[PDB]
C-alpha cells in the first residue's frame, strides 16, 4: 500500500506514534516518506545483505526475521514480511522498538539526512488527525 501523506499521518497516529519517545507525528511521517516513500511494501538490500522493510524500512540486521540476514537479530519478533503490510500496526510497534534502542529516530538513515532538524511539522500539515 502507498499511503497519502495525511493517510499514513492517521496511521501512524492511529498506532500511537505520534509523539511517541518525542517524535512528533510529523517526524514519522518524514522518516516513512524518505524510506518508503509512503510505500508499505518498499524492501531495499543493504550492502551488508540484511534487507530494509516497509513503510519505515526496518533493518533484517536488527529488527525483522528475514531468514537471510545471518547474524541478524529480530529484536521486534517478527518476520520482515510483517513490516511490508498494508496495516502498519507491525511496523509501527517495531518501529516503536527501534526508536526506543537508545539513539532514537536516528536509527533512520533517511530521518537523521532528510527529517531531522526540519521543518517537520509540513509532514502532517493539514491533516485530519
Known sequence: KVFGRCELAAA??????????????????????FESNFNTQA????????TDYGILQINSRWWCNDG?????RNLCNIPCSALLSSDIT????????????????????AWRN??????????????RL
Open 12 to 33: 501512524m497516529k492511529r498506532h500511537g506514534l505520534d509523539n511517541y519517545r518525542g517524535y512528533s507525528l510529523g517526524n514519522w511521517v518524514c522518516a516513512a516518506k
Open 68 to 72: 537471510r540476514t545471518p547474524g541478524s
Open 114 to 127: 532528510r527529517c531531522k532538524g526540519t521543518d517537520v511539522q509540513a509532514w502532517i500539515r493539514g491533516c
Open 90 to 109: 507491525a511496523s509501527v510497534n517495531c518501529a516503536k522498538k527501534i526508536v526506543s534502542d537508545g539513539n532514537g529516530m536516528n536509527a533512520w538513515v
Open 43 to 50: 524492501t531495499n538490500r543493504n550492502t551488508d545483505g540484511s
